[PDB]
Design a protein around this ligand. Structure first.
Ligand SMILES: *[C@@H]1O[C@H](CO)[C@@H](O[C@@H]2O[C@H](CO)[C@@H](O[C@@H]3O[C@H](CO[C@H]4O[C@H](CO)[C@@H](O)[C@H](O)[C@@H]4O)[C@@H](O)[C@H](O)[C@@H]3O)[C@H](O)[C@H]2NC(C)=O)[C@H](O)[C@H]1NC(C)=O
Ligand SMILES: *[C@@H]1O[C@H](CO)[C@@H](O[C@@H]2O[C@H](CO)[C@@H](O[C@@H]3O[C@H](CO[C@H]4O[C@H](CO)[C@@H](O)[C@H](O)[C@@H]4O)[C@@H](O)[C@H](O)[C@@H]3O)[C@H](O)[C@H]2NC(C)=O)[C@H](O)[C@H]1NC(C)=O
Ligand SMILES: *[C@@H]1O[C@H](CO)[C@@H](O[C@@H]2O[C@H](CO)[C@@H](O[C@@H]3O[C@H](CO)[C@@H](O)[C@H](O)[C@@H]3O)[C@H](O)[C@H]2NC(C)=O)[C@H](O)[C@H]1NC(C)=O
Ligand SMILES: *[C@@H]1O[C@H](CO)[C@@H](O[C@@H]2O[C@H](CO)[C@@H](O[C@@H]3O[C@H](CO)[C@@H](O)[C@H](O)[C@@H]3O)[C@H](O)[C@H]2NC(C)=O)[C@H](O)[C@H]1NC(C)=O
Ligand SMILES: *[C@@H]1O[C@H](CO)[C@@H](O[C@@H]2O[C@H](CO)[C@@H](O)[C@H](O)[C@H]2NC(C)=O)[C@H](O)[C@H]1NC(C)=O
Ligand SMILES: *[C@@H]1O[C@H](CO)[C@@H](O[C@@H]2O[C@H](CO)[C@@H](O)[C@H](O)[C@H]2NC(C)=O)[C@H](O)[C@H]1NC(C)=O
Ligand SMILES: *[C@@H]1O[C@H](CO)[C@@H](O[C@@H]2O[C@H](CO)[C@@H](O)[C@H](O)[C@H]2NC(C)=O)[C@H](O)[C@H]1NC(C)=O
Ligand SMILES: *[C@@H]1O[C@H](CO)[C@@H](O[C@@H]2O[C@H](CO)[C@@H](O)[C@H](O)[C@H]2NC(C)=O)[C@H](O)[C@H]1NC(C)=O
Ligand SMILES: *[C@@H]1O[C@H](CO)[C@@H](O[C@@H]2O[C@H](CO)[C@@H](O)[C@H](O)[C@H]2NC(C)=O)[C@H](O)[C@H]1NC(C)=O
Ligand SMILES: *[C@@H]1O[C@H](CO)[C@@H](O)[C@H](O)[C@H]1NC(C)=O
Ligand SMILES: *[C@@H]1O[C@H](CO)[C@@H](O)[C@H](O)[C@H]1NC(C)=O
Ligand SMILES: *[C@@H]1O[C@H](CO)[C@@H](O)[C@H](O)[C@H]1NC(C)=O
Ligand SMILES: *[C@@H]1O[C@H](CO)[C@@H](O)[C@H](O)[C@H]1NC(C)=O
Ligand SMILES: *[C@@H]1O[C@H](CO)[C@@H](O)[C@H](O)[C@H]1NC(C)=O
Ligand SMILES: COc1cccc(OC)c1O
Ligand SMILES: COc1cccc(OC)c1O
Ligand SMILES: [Cl-]
Ligand SMILES: [Cl-]
Ligand SMILES: [Cu+2]
Ligand SMILES: [Cu+2]
Ligand SMILES: [Cu+2]
Ligand SMILES: [Cu+2]
Ligand SMILES: [Cu+2]
Ligand SMILES: [Cu+2]
Ligand SMILES: [Cu+2]
Ligand SMILES: [Cu+2]
Lengths: 559, 559
């Protein structure tokens, strides 16, 4: 609970805690728990928000999205998940939530847990809210989140600008009429489809029939409004803009940044931006437009103009009349101009590229099926029935090759990772890379070029070392690997655990595009509570009993 | 020579000849021949128009393009080509010129002729100008035209709109620093590059250094100007627009059409439009913009804003100040709205899909190299040393499989062709399909959707018969095969000969994307003159003597 957080002083939170606190090492002791139940059900012939009826969806508490999780900085969030699906296991991942010393609550099935079995299986997740901002949660059972197992998280806390009104969460997502497993199967041997529509805060209008509704945000004139934008898609990467207005960024993913005003923003899959919008224009109805850049390299939609309505309180109703002008083409790249309020500093002059710090991503067209993604020569394939945590708890170091384990033994040290985007393959795509358990620093990437250009770069020390930034670089949980190029990341090994690092395009991670950082495994085993161990074993026993009875095979990586 | 073609009556030509004459069956007997010599040379370290030096080019008469051929309707055009290259053969194709009963002057090496040998080989082409309009010529020796063996043709004649000034030819082309054989090799195993620049009437500014010059077209205030726009690219498909001005289309390819006013136009590779621009606006400098649509499915350039300057005479110099608005995205599709002045009508209700009228295009990824294009199961591969005409002249009917012979014995009948774009393959691309020896009627295509959306269509007669048009449809020599769809064409078998029908993207035809329509072969042999037969045998004899001495292999289809 805050004691000095006001519109004119959003920097302030409580005694000892403000915007400048190092929230990665200091957390309020509130002693409060916010708890929730997620009852997952399987619904056939479900009428969606654009008038179209979908074959099958998978819903939490019967709605298009799960509960909006809301708690304060330092609270505990607790969620009992009850799996009432017909065949699928399930696992809920808290995306953005670092799970400091609570790896077994990460929700990564095959890594930190077995799937919760269907027909009534249950598990209670429990995690400390040690970071304030906007995050989201979703199934990690193959591509199940594409069926509806998805929701948002708002952990209140201080901010880097003053503002009057918190408008709350604003999820934007691709929307397909075809069910997730059908799309996985299709994307194994075909290039991915455009989306059927793009939902903004759960609604859109049908581009063909005119059924459905525009999302409608009411602005209070003369007021500063915080809007928490999310990209909860399975594949589409979005550019957003508000006709006749600017947006001032105050956080990126779950990291507060210094105020940065822009005309439009790129959101990769899984990215978030908290913005402040001043209602200082003529009182009217204004379009909020979703657009695509990068020449379809990171998605498109069969709805030519997805949009919502920003309405000035006290103005006429009806539709905006100004279509406005197209935003700048972001070429499927997030901005590296953001600067966190709480700084970090690392050296970059000393980096040397070596097999043990290099992650080559490659598309393999030679095997079955056609599209298999490999990192360091291997497509990930987890075993839902023998998670990496099982090996840790039984002292088994014989990890299978397909688990893509990258063991990182350094204790609380900065580690450096060069990810290479198939520079020598016939074709290369942008990928939204996401790290569990940590925010990373984005130290540099290959020069910014048009996404579909097929321009290729290999890291050259004689030109690229000088292009890296170790002085308070963008710090967050998801960033873009450039088509045909490279990305250099760093994170500190402060959190023992098995942590996935993976492309967040569902079809890609389904296709193998992941590794698993095994951070400080010796330290990890010592830190697992008897409570966490017993319950991990309980779920695994139930999953292992269930699986032989399942009528469908596993046909992808499991993630 | 005309007698009644003036600015207010452009419809008039001479006694018996006007815009409504059927130029396909009636031609002025002028008795005049216009002759040219084309001297081909190989130039290394050539300084091109944007300031960059190219490794190697191949030039006609030492310039970036060959001579502008110009003659009157009914004239004879005669060109002596002297091949002074070091190693390559050559053969010049007159694109848009139907070669009525002159198949052996078509310039299709491996089909109508052996290539002209280097180190001084020569051949004289002679053909009748039985069509008036704007066409072009280029080498057909693999992708050699990508090195500079290219130029324009203007055959003067009547028009469908009055105009005051003929501005003449305005060729727009992609421009690569790499040589054609290097691009062919590259494209065999890799997605194709964006162009380095886009030249407009032989010039452009380097977007990095600012070296070079904009094309500068001077307009006469208050006058109507005919502009003859061509796309002479190897891969790039262009949208063109002129800030604050419309363009009135008066011909498409070499076929006069009823006036059609538009804001912007799409030109496929090989396509031409004659347009009339009225200098009716305020005197100033206006940008003529080249842009890309279809989300890169049909090209892009690394020059972000290729452009020319249209200057009103007596206005200030310098650069245009108004950037304008982007045109509508043409999604890599030419317009089907144009209507020829001289009409054709064919039945569409009787069309039945069968194997013998269907041409399935497919990318085969299983062989070597990676990107191989097949039509009806086979990638074309011609024998420069034994052209199809050789089989004809010796009465040998055992045509190799690789020659992709589609024999068509019908005498002067409409024939229907359904072209299918790999609807079952993992991804599909738009293709600019070009027919030698005829203009075709465009009877229909799959529904217009976004070029990069990977939506797929298979001809369904219950839905698609109704979408066909045989009431004076578009008639021309090049049109777009939609990404993932289909195209229905028709031509009348009025021209005995061996006629290529191919994608005009150099990299694809290199890769196998062609067939060879062997039209009425019995009639073909009787109409070949003793001079044509003798000279064919002369050039083949010299080519066959030369080839064993070539230090380089043929690495592609020959086309
Ligand atoms: C989790 O639960 C999911 C929901 O039941 C499971 O997905 C189902 O998985 C099976 C087996 O992979 C699929 O069954 C196949 O369906 C395909 C394709 O059907 C498509 O096309 C037909 C028309 O031909 C149309 O009827 C459908 O709408 C589809 O678009 C068949 O060709 C196969 O032979 C086979 O029957 C189901 O389609 C699929 N359902 C959905 C809605 O995705 C999934 O397996 C479960 N996962 C686990 C690990 O338990
Ligand atoms: C028609 O004439 C053309 C011009 O002479 C011929 O093209 C040449 O063909 C040869 C034989 O294949 C090529 O030689 C190969 O070159 C490649 C690539 O070298 C280039 O690129 C690399 C790297 O980007 C660069 O380092 C070089 O400096 C080159 O620019 C090499 O890998 C091989 O070692 C081999 O030498 C020529 O490069 C190619 N030249 C050009 C300018 O296109 C063509 O073969 C002739 N065709 C016929 C049928 O006679
Ligand atoms: C922001 O979103 C809005 C709403 O989706 C977009 O407005 C839409 O703009 C398009 C493009 O101009 C309009 O479609 C066109 O309309 C004309 C006239 O009917 C027609 O000739 C074209 O064929 C085309 O269909 C559309 O009416 C309009 N929608 C509404 C409800 O007003 C807007 O373009 C988006 N802005 C940006 C910058 O992305
Ligand atoms: C038609 O072609 C002209 C000429 O290429 C285009 O004009 C150019 O427009 C671009 C985009 O606005 C300008 O680039 C911008 O420059 C400013 C600095 O002044 C900078 O803020 C941006 O980062 C961007 O690079 C460019 O200056 C301008 N060129 C000239 C010589 O005026 C025009 O955009 C094209 N119009 C259409 C409809 O395609
Ligand atoms: C967006 O929501 C607002 C708020 O509910 C709607 O605004 C009202 O519009 C009606 C007429 O349609 C007026 O009579 C009210 O005075 C408005 N309220 C306020 C507070 O300004 C608006 O209609 C909605 N827009 C759409 C497209 O439905
Ligand atoms: C990527 O795979 C390569 C090949 O297995 C790994 O390279 C080895 O790294 C270990 C640890 O440094 C060394 O002992 C070996 O000498 C390396 N083998 C070879 C032949 O290079 C590499 O470590 C893997 N990288 C990552 C990030 O997981
Ligand atoms: C295309 O560019 C050529 C550049 O040569 C232009 O042709 C010249 O233009 C001037 C002025 O109109 C003529 O008087 C010269 O005699 C021409 N030279 C040659 C060799 O043809 C031409 O004008 C350009 N076309 C347009 C529309 O600007
Ligand atoms: C395009 O060409 C025209 C020539 O037709 C140039 O227009 C002249 O501009 C100069 C000033 O630079 C004037 O003194 C002349 O009087 C103009 N002549 C006419 C006939 O209008 C124009 O400068 C050229 N544009 C560019 C970019 O070079
Ligand atoms: C494409 O290839 C197939 C051969 O697989 C051709 O189909 C044959 O055509 C003849 C008629 O000319 C029929 O008698 C045979 O029954 C067909 N065979 C099959 C398997 O259907 C087809 O003609 C070819 N099409 C074109 C336009 O070349
Ligand atoms: C889950 O939701 C369904 C659908 O409303 C309901 O019938 C069921 O009893 C719920 N189960 C539990 C244990 O929450
Ligand atoms: C999002 O939609 C919900 C309805 O579920 C509404 O309560 C909320 O105000 C919306 N938020 C915005 C910013 O429009
Ligand atoms: C490691 O795990 C595998 C799979 O369960 C098992 O076969 C092997 O016996 C285990 N080894 C140890 C040391 O427990
Ligand atoms: C062609 O051009 C070259 C160089 O310009 C010249 O040496 C040669 O004599 C010319 N050859 C002929 C036959 O025209
Ligand atoms: C007919 O052509 C084929 C293909 O070149 C050839 O192998 C065969 O020898 C020819 N036969 C005659 C009689 O020339
Ligand atoms: C834009 O997205 C894509 C385009 C082409 C191929 C892909 O994966 C095989 C893919 O994911
Ligand atoms: C958009 O252009 C292309 C992309 C990928 C492969 C191609 O050749 C097979 C190609 O021509
Ligand atoms: Cl996370
Ligand atoms: Cl032709
Ligand atoms: Cu996530
Ligand atoms: Cu995550
Ligand atoms: Cu990816
Ligand atoms: Cu994950
Ligand atoms: Cu051509
Ligand atoms: Cu041609
Ligand atoms: Cu093609
Ligand atoms: Cu051709």
């Amino acid at each position: 609970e805050p004691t000095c957080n006001t519109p004119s002083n959003r920097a302030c939170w409580s005694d000892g805690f403000d915007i400048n606190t190092d929230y990665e090492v200091s957390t309020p002791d509130t002693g409060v728990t916010q708890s929730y139940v997620f009852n997952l059900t399987e619904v056939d012939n479900w009428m969606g928000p654009d008038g179209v009826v979908k074959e099958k969806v998978m819903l939490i508490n019967g709605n298009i999205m799960g509960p909006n999780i809301v708690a304060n900085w330092g609270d505990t969030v607790e969620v009992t998940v009850i799996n009432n699906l017909v065949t699928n296991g399930t696992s809920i991942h808290w995306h953005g939530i670092h799970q400091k010393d609570t790896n077994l609550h990460d929700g990564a099935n095959g890594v930190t847990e077995c799937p919760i079995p269907p027909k009534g299986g249950q598990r209670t997740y429990r995690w400390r809210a040690r970071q304030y901002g906007t995050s989201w949660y979703h199934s990690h059972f193959s591509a199940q989140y594409g069926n509806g197992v998805v929701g948002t998280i708002q952990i209140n806390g201080p901010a880097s600008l003053p503002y009057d009104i918190d408008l709350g969460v604003f999820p934007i997502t691709d929307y397909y009429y075809r069910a997730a497993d059908d799309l996985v199967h299709f994307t194994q041997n075909n290039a991915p489809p455009f989306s059927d529509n793009v939902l903004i805060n759960g609604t859109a209008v049908n581009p063909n029939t005119g059924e459905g509704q525009y999302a409608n945000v009411t602005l209070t004139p003369g007021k500063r409004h915080r809007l928490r934008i999310l990209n909860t898609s399975t594949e589409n990467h979005f550019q957003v803009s508000l006709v006749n207005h600017t947006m001032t960024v105050i956080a990126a993913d779950m990291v507060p940044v210094n105020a940065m005003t822009v005309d439009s923003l790129f959101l990769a899959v899984g990215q978030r931006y908290d913005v402040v919008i001043d209602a200082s224009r003529a009182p009217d109805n204004y379009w909020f437009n979703v657009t695509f850049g990068g020449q379809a390299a990171c998605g498109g939609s069969l709805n030519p103009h997805p949009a919502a309505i920003f309405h000035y309180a006290g103005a006429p109703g009806g539709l905006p009349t100004d279509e406005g002008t197209p935003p700048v083409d972001h070429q499927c790249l997030d901005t590296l101009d953001v600067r966190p309020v709480v700084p970090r500093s690392v050296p970059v002059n000393s980096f040397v590229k070596r097999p043990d710090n290099t992650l080559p991503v490659a598309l393999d067209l030679t095997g079955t099926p056609l599209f298999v993604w490999k990192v360091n020569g291997s497509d990930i394939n987890v075993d839902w029935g023998k998670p990496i945590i099982d090996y840790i708890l039984t002292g088994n170091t014989s990890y299978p090759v397909s688990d893509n384990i990258v063991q990182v033994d350094a204790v609380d040290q900065w580690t450096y990772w060069l990810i290479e985007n198939d520079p020598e393959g016939p074709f290369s795509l942008p990928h939204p890379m996401h790290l569990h358990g940590h925010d990373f620093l984005v130290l540099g990437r290959s020069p910014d070029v048009p996404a579909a250009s097929q321009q290729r770069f290999v890291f050259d020390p004689a030109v690229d070392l000088a292009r890296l930034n170790g002085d308070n670089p963008p710090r967050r949980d998801t960033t873009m690997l450039p088509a045909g190029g490279w990305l250099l990341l760093a994170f500190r090994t402060d959190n023992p655990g098995a942590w996935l690092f993976h492309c967040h395009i569902a079809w890609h991670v389904s296709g193998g595009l992941s590794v698993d950082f095994l951070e400080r495994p010796a330290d990890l085993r010592q830190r697992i509570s008897q409570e966490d161990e017993d319950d991990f074993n309980r779920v695994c026993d139930e999953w292992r009993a269930y699986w032989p009875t399942n009528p469908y095979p596993k046909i992808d990586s499991g993630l």
